[model samples]
Target: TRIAILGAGPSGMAQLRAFQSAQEKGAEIPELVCFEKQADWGGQWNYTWRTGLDENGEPVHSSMYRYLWSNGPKECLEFADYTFDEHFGKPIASYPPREVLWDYIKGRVEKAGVRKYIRFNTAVRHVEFNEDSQTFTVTVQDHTTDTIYSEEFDYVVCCTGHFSTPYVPEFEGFEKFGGRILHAHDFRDALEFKDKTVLLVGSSSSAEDIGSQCYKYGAKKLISCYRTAPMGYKWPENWDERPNLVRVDTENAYFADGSSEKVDAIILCTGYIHHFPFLNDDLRLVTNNRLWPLNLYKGVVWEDNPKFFYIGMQDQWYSFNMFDAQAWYARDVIMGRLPLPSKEEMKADSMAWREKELTLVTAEEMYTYQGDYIQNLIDMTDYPSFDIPATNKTFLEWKHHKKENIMTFRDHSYRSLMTGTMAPKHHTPWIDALDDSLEAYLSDK
Candidate 1:
């Protein structure tokens, strides 16, 4: 059997790892071929200074930024099979900087020796399904030798993540704004906003973190506008919450409550879209970012065509860890270890999960709901099972710590469920740790 996996990000890497693990255990894994548009792997963890588009004119896939630290405890996203204890060989801080965490992700794949299966600088241009042959024709553009080619695969797994194509919303007076305006996807460094009063257009993690990064780097003032309600965090003195931003001019932004603020730049922390332009309309999984996206039997297989699958495509509460579970589950289905039910049965299972997803009210309940889904995936796969309840607890604590003090939450450490060891506090506070290099993050001094 032949398999074509798209986008060598966390999900794609997890799929590679899943196949590698099975091959190691003498499972006789199928021919696995992975295509990545980027020059290297690590997906979103693969940080890039380039924004909007790459040298090949492809939209830059990374949303990572300089000085960006892990928003959640690393313990929650721990690699159960390859624990932090094995990777770093020491108990580091629970919340690592982007580079440090990226190193950890690289460490796993590097050790697995699965890099051979990945074709870098190759972008999947189109994925077409033939019903008669029950095969997929994957057309990809290889940027190396400037070649466009096609191949046939029995199964196709899309791990090309949803965070690339940003949902850029336009304000009434956006064209009239004199200062620079870009979505959070283009935000690379907060130092650029130093001494500038930047107006953020959303109140989610992107806004909070980018806004906080600005403040930490000496931004004069920070303003965030929320459509639903205020984040209600204990922001620093210079930070203020405003209602929906109605419009913005050259030097000022007007709010819904008849207020205005002088601003230097505007950032749309507006979320991303599940943009799989490579797939045909019938094969496309079109849905907003949510917990239970319909038509997947176990949240991995495509009900309409079980041969086509996805990883890390849902409204993710779980990141690396959850992707591992789905990748492993997807592997089983492809290997015939776990047979997929009928299309109707698959949709029925998906609807039940979606129904439960609709009833979630609080953050704690939400994480648990996602945890249960991951739990189901783990039970049917060979992926190492750690304490889901404990991971869920850590996630809950992360929420409380953020609410208690948004800035200082990174200071709090949590115990790793995999190793049962407490994470050591970092030598420098997150705000003062301006350098996010791997060396700076790991330095004992």
Candidate 2:
């Protein structure tokens, strides 16, 4: 059997690490294939061009940009096999910059021998599932050479990630503003909004970060518009002390304070919709006008098709390492060691979770925050092979068993230095590892 992974980001790497463990246990080690569309890896960081000009009309430092440090701390993030030096004798609470992370991931890809399996500059256009053979007929093209190729895989793990498609909100005759208007993704830095009255749309993390930074960089006035108030949670200290930021909560071009307030520019961070163009439509991923399925039993695999699983689709007040938990359960199920949930059970759980979200946050707030909301697959499944740690103690102790270990920042005593709070729910193993691992990996290199 062969397995194919799309993209080479953190999610893709997680699948690789888990699959590697499956192989070591004498499970049918699938012939691994990872397709990367870029000439180099580092999905977002690789594409981040530095802001400057060079000699002979060329770009300078065309790889990565400045001021791209992770909001997370360094000591809390690392991969399964490696650990940032416990005795590195440096500031562990600091976040690693973007270039540092890119280099660290590159090092892991090389050292782990996964680099050889990757076909660089190759983009998979479509994958036609052949029910007759239960295999995927994947059509791919080499971006550099413009050559098309076809291949088949027994299983496919898509980690293309959510940010691939940018969400641009449509306003009423946006030409009315008669000034520069763009989505948050296109926005490079606060320099664009300097000396401008910027109307930052949405209340998501991106919008919050941009609005806060632009305010710092001498923006004339930052008018943040949202249908409802955002939770406005942050890692660092002094989160509640933001200044020169106005919160506007109105719908359908409505205003409360005054319509006289003019906006020179609008930065819409309204968030993005879930887009997986490759997945078949029969999945019915969306239900009730929400980006959630009607039959996602545990929020991982669908009841209709257990083979098709989802990762990184959640909207809880908790950390995102929940994806790791979901993926871990999926890995076990795919290995045939665990049984899945019944259709009825899956539906009930999905409803309960949907109601739970509704109770916690408003519909508009959920749309802005959750974006593409989906259920946790592990919870939907009937098998109890995998268990989420009841306490922080059990959570850290359980890491020793897994071949692909995950360490939570919430569990660490030094988390206050990094995140500025010890919120149990804000912990994510994957993100934490990314920050800390890069620091250690760089020092070793």
Candidate 3:
């Protein structure tokens, strides 16, 4: 038996580590092949100065930009199997920059010696499953040789994340606005907005963070318009949150509240689509980015077809460890250690989760809901279970901290559920830490 894993990101790496753990424990594992579109292992963490298309004419996978720190506490996403102390050799801060976290992710998989199974520079094109054969035919494009080919696998795990494709919404007079109009995916450097008035559309993490970035770096003014209620954080003087944007003129943007602001640039921080153009319609899981995506048994297995699995495809709150739990569960089912229920049973289970998901009304409840899902997965597999309750508590604290002071939230620290060690506060405040280099971040000040 053979398995095909797509995308060598955190989720894909977790899947590889799961099987490697089984192989070490004297369990016979199937032949595993991982296809990664990027040249390196870290998917979103692998940053590039180049955007749009790469030298090979392939769409760039990384949407991350410079000076980006973990928006959430690192303890919330730490791998249960690999503690922060185990990887960093000490307890680092709770909110590490992109490079620091990426290194930590690579360390565990590198130690597992599973990098050999991954084929970098290879992009999956299409996936088709045959009912009678009980096999999936995966077509991939090898950028190295410029060749497209197909392979058959007993199972396919789709780990491609949802953030790569940008969702840019059109406003009236966008074509004639004359100022730079870009998506959050295209935003790379805050220095580019220095002394310029910037307007951001949307009020989620992207809008908050990018608007904060522009404010921290020296933007003359930061105006954010939201269709819903404002993030409602205590914003700085130059930062203003307004109602939804009505339209943009050549030199200004009009808001729904009958106010207008002169803007030098406009950024669309509207979210991303759960896109899987590669999968055939039958195998495709179509849903808005949500906590509970339908047609998945235990949020891992494809209910309609038990052999197909998806990892890290949910609207994430618990990221790395959640993927690990799902991957371990998927691995067990693939290895025949866990027998899957009937299709009806699977549908009922998924609906049960969705039903619970619908009742969540608060941020705390949302994370807790995801925590319950992760705990369910951990109980079914050998994945080390961490303190989900403690993690959830940390999340609640994080929310309170953010509400207290959005700019100083990253300055606060949390104790790791895996290591039981309190993260030390960073020497530099997030707002002033212009140099987001890993060395600068890890230095003893």
TM-scores for all candidates: the values are 0.98, 0.68, 0.97
Ranking by TM-score: 1, 3, 2
Alpha carbon lDDT at 175, candidate 2: 49
Model 1 regions lying over 4 Å from their true place = none
User: If both were scored by TM-score, which would come out higher, candidate 1 or candidate 2?
Assistant: 1
Candidate 3, after superposition: displacement of residue 78 in Å? 2.4
Q: Write the per-residue lDDT of candidate 2 for residues 6-79, one digit (tens) a residue.
A: 77666556566566656655667658788876665665556443333322221221222234454344333444
Best by lDDT: 1
Ranking the candidates on lDDT from highest down gives: 1, 3, 2
After superposing candidate 2 on the true structure, give the runs of residues whose Cα lies further than 4 Å from its correct spot: 24-27, 44-47, 50-66, 73-80, 86-89, 104-110, 230-254, 287-297, 316-320, 341-445
lDDT, candidates in the order shown: 0.89, 0.52, 0.88
lDDT, candidate 2, equals 0.52
Relative to the true structure, candidate 2 reaches a TM of: 0.68
- Better structure of 1 and 3 per TM-score: 1
lDDT of model 1, residue 440: 79
